[PDB]
Amino acid sequence: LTAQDEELTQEIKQEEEQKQQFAQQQEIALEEKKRLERHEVWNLEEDKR
Amino acid sequence: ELDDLKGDQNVKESQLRKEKAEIESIEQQLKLKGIEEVRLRIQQVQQEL
């Protein structure tokens, strides 16, 4: 049970890390969708700075 | 206190990664901008989302 507990601890940690990775990717995808949608030129030139 | 400071620093690092990714996205949209290119990139972003 100690070995299984260690395995579960590691697995839960990695799953939370992957959840955060997916959350980051999702947020950036939404942002890129926004920038692809409307006001592309001026927004692109303004934001980078 | 150390745990709180490390959590805040990691939050800042995550935001920094997000901003780097958004700069990359701005550069990519600047390179790509074009009605056909915009359509394809919107489709790609939808698939990624």
XYZ file of N, CA and C in Angstrom:
294
model
N 0.818 -1.202 0.000
C 0.000 0.000 0.000
C 0.854 1.255 0.000
N 2.030 1.229 0.632
C 2.917 2.385 0.543
C 3.384 2.606 -0.888
N 3.759 1.530 -1.580
C 4.163 1.677 -2.975
C 3.019 2.228 -3.818
N 1.814 1.683 -3.638
C 0.676 2.165 -4.413
C 0.366 3.621 -4.083
N 0.495 4.003 -2.813
C 0.277 5.390 -2.424
C 1.268 6.314 -3.110
N 2.540 5.918 -3.159
C 3.520 6.738 -3.861
C 3.157 6.868 -5.333
N 2.752 5.759 -5.955
C 2.358 5.818 -7.357
C 1.204 6.791 -7.548
N 0.199 6.719 -6.677
C -0.952 7.597 -6.825
C -0.577 9.051 -6.594
N 0.312 9.321 -5.639
C 0.765 10.693 -5.437
C 1.405 11.235 -6.705
N 2.343 10.476 -7.276
C 3.003 10.939 -8.490
C 2.001 11.128 -9.618
N 1.067 10.189 -9.768
C 0.110 10.279 -10.861
C -0.779 11.503 -10.715
N -1.279 11.760 -9.507
C -2.129 12.927 -9.309
C -1.346 14.204 -9.576
N -0.095 14.262 -9.118
C 0.716 15.446 -9.378
C 0.868 15.682 -10.877
N 1.228 14.634 -11.619
C 1.426 14.797 -13.055
C 0.123 15.150 -13.760
N -0.995 14.571 -13.324
C -2.269 14.900 -13.949
C -2.635 16.354 -13.708
N -2.374 16.872 -12.508
C -2.636 18.290 -12.280
C -1.730 19.156 -13.145
N -0.468 18.757 -13.299
C 0.428 19.524 -14.158
C -0.079 19.538 -15.596
N -0.528 18.385 -16.093
C -1.064 18.334 -17.449
C -2.359 19.123 -17.565
N -3.175 19.129 -16.514
C -4.375 19.953 -16.523
C -4.010 21.418 -16.684
N -2.993 21.873 -15.952
C -2.555 23.257 -16.099
C -1.981 23.519 -17.487
N -1.255 22.554 -18.048
C -0.749 22.710 -19.408
C -1.897 22.897 -20.393
N -2.922 22.052 -20.287
C -4.075 22.177 -21.168
C -4.785 23.501 -20.948
N -4.877 23.951 -19.699
C -5.513 25.238 -19.435
C -4.750 26.372 -20.109
N -3.420 26.351 -20.014
C -2.616 27.366 -20.688
C -2.856 27.334 -22.189
N -2.799 26.140 -22.781
C -2.990 26.035 -24.222
C -4.373 26.521 -24.623
N -5.391 26.170 -23.841
C -6.752 26.593 -24.142
C -6.877 28.109 -24.089
N -6.307 28.730 -23.057
C -6.400 30.180 -22.945
C -5.693 30.861 -24.108
N -4.503 30.377 -24.465
C -3.778 30.985 -25.574
C -4.529 30.770 -26.880
N -5.177 29.616 -27.034
C -5.968 29.372 -28.234
C -7.143 30.335 -28.320
N -7.811 30.588 -27.196
C -8.900 31.561 -27.198
C -8.384 32.950 -27.559
N -7.231 33.329 -27.005
C -6.666 34.639 -27.316
C -6.332 34.756 -28.798
N -5.735 33.710 -29.370
C -5.403 33.744 -30.788
C -6.662 33.762 -31.641
N -7.718 33.080 -31.198
C -8.998 33.173 -31.893
C -9.505 34.607 -31.889
N -9.430 35.267 -30.733
C -9.821 36.669 -30.658
C -9.044 37.502 -31.668
N -7.717 37.370 -31.663
C -6.895 38.208 -32.532
C -7.092 37.862 -34.004
N -7.455 36.615 -34.308
C -7.785 36.256 -35.682
C -9.160 36.772 -36.075
N -10.005 37.082 -35.092
C -11.374 37.479 -35.403
C -11.445 38.922 -35.890
N -11.058 39.873 -35.042
C -11.440 41.262 -35.249
C -10.245 42.177 -35.024
N -10.214 43.272 -35.786
C -9.251 44.354 -35.586
C -7.813 43.843 -35.644
N -7.496 43.058 -36.674
C -6.245 42.309 -36.679
C -5.026 43.221 -36.798
N -5.033 44.155 -37.751
C -3.803 44.878 -38.082
C -3.349 45.736 -36.905
N -4.208 46.659 -36.472
C -3.818 47.592 -35.424
C -3.520 46.858 -34.125
N -4.334 45.856 -33.790
C -4.081 45.089 -32.575
C -2.729 44.394 -32.644
N -2.413 43.791 -33.791
C -1.141 43.094 -33.941
C 0.026 44.052 -33.769
N -0.070 45.239 -34.366
C 1.043 46.180 -34.279
C 1.160 46.773 -32.879
N 0.026 47.022 -32.224
C 0.042 47.675 -30.920
C 0.520 46.724 -29.828
N -0.002 45.496 -29.822
C 0.190 44.614 -28.675
C 1.653 44.236 -28.488
N 2.363 43.959 -29.584
C 3.696 43.378 -29.472
C 4.589 44.201 -28.553
N 4.508 45.527 -28.643
C 5.312 46.369 -27.763
C 4.877 46.202 -26.312
N 6.180 31.062 4.646
C 6.517 32.214 3.818
C 7.231 31.783 2.544
N 8.161 30.833 2.657
C 8.876 30.354 1.480
C 7.921 29.732 0.477
N 6.974 28.926 0.958
C 6.015 28.306 0.053
C 5.167 29.359 -0.649
N 4.715 30.374 0.089
C 3.920 31.431 -0.532
C 4.728 32.177 -1.589
N 5.981 32.507 -1.270
C 6.820 33.214 -2.231
C 7.043 32.377 -3.479
N 7.302 31.079 -3.308
C 7.519 30.224 -4.466
C 6.259 30.116 -5.310
N 5.095 30.029 -4.667
C 3.854 30.002 -5.424
C 3.659 31.261 -6.246
N 3.910 32.421 -5.638
C 3.780 33.669 -6.383
C 4.764 33.719 -7.543
N 6.005 33.290 -7.307
C 7.003 33.317 -8.368
C 6.604 32.399 -9.515
N 6.060 31.224 -9.197
C 5.609 30.321 -10.246
C 4.417 30.893 -11.001
N 3.530 31.611 -10.312
C 2.438 32.290 -11.006
C 2.995 33.310 -11.991
N 3.981 34.091 -11.549
C 4.611 35.052 -12.446
C 5.252 34.346 -13.631
N 5.894 33.204 -13.388
C 6.518 32.465 -14.479
C 5.478 31.966 -15.472
N 4.339 31.487 -14.973
C 3.277 31.038 -15.868
C 2.757 32.191 -16.716
N 2.544 33.354 -16.098
C 2.108 34.513 -16.871
C 3.163 34.916 -17.892
N 4.441 34.813 -17.524
C 5.511 35.134 -18.462
C 5.490 34.192 -19.656
N 5.293 32.898 -19.406
C 5.182 31.946 -20.504
C 3.995 32.288 -21.392
N 2.871 32.660 -20.777
C 1.692 33.037 -21.549
C 1.981 34.244 -22.434
N 2.659 35.252 -21.885
C 2.968 36.443 -22.671
C 3.940 36.123 -23.798
N 4.919 35.258 -23.541
C 5.822 34.837 -24.607
C 5.047 34.153 -25.725
N 4.126 33.262 -25.354
C 3.315 32.584 -26.355
C 2.458 33.568 -27.135
N 1.925 34.592 -26.468
C 1.107 35.572 -27.175
C 1.947 36.433 -28.110
N 3.188 36.742 -27.734
C 4.086 37.434 -28.658
C 4.338 36.565 -29.884
N 4.582 35.274 -29.657
C 4.746 34.348 -30.772
C 3.513 34.348 -31.666
N 2.325 34.344 -31.060
C 1.087 34.362 -31.831
C 0.953 35.646 -32.640
N 1.316 36.785 -32.047
C 1.259 38.046 -32.777
C 2.185 37.998 -33.982
N 3.404 37.492 -33.792
C 4.324 37.374 -34.917
C 3.757 36.452 -35.991
N 3.168 35.329 -35.577
C 2.621 34.382 -36.542
C 1.480 35.001 -37.337
N 0.582 35.724 -36.663
C -0.520 36.376 -37.366
C -0.010 37.467 -38.297
N 1.001 38.224 -37.862
C 1.600 39.219 -38.742
C 2.142 38.561 -40.003
N 2.840 37.438 -39.845
C 3.385 36.730 -40.997
C 2.273 36.195 -41.893
N 1.185 35.716 -41.288
C 0.227 34.895 -42.020
C -0.873 35.729 -42.663
N -1.140 36.922 -42.133
C -2.398 37.612 -42.415
C -2.760 37.562 -43.893
N -3.958 37.066 -44.162
C -4.439 36.905 -45.519
C -5.694 36.062 -45.478
N -6.636 36.415 -46.353
C -7.983 35.863 -46.225
C -7.940 34.337 -46.212
N -7.242 33.732 -47.174
C -7.076 32.283 -47.149
C -6.266 31.852 -45.935
N -5.154 32.542 -45.672
C -4.322 32.195 -44.527
C -5.094 32.366 -43.227
N -5.893 33.428 -43.129
C -6.691 33.649 -41.930
C -7.708 32.529 -41.758
N -8.354 32.111 -42.848
C -9.291 30.996 -42.751
C -8.596 29.739 -42.243
N -7.450 29.397 -42.836
C -6.745 28.184 -42.426
C -6.299 28.272 -40.973
N -5.779 29.428 -40.561
C -5.301 29.562 -39.192
C -6.451 29.538 -38.196
N -7.602 30.108 -38.556
C -8.777 30.013 -37.695
C -9.184 28.557 -37.533
N -9.170 27.801 -38.632
C -9.496 26.380 -38.540
C -8.502 25.646 -37.645
N -7.209 25.944 -37.796
C -6.196 25.297 -36.965
C -6.401 25.630 -35.495
N -6.705 26.893 -35.196
C -6.921 27.306 -33.814
C -8.158 26.627 -33.245
N -9.211 26.498 -34.053
C -10.403 25.793 -33.598
C -10.087 24.339 -33.278
N -9.311 23.683 -34.142
C -8.928 22.299 -33.884
C -8.112 22.190 -32.601
N -7.169 23.112 -32.402
C -6.355 23.093 -31.192
C -7.213 23.306 -29.954
N -8.177 24.225 -30.031
C -9.068 24.459 -28.903
C -9.899 23.224 -28.596
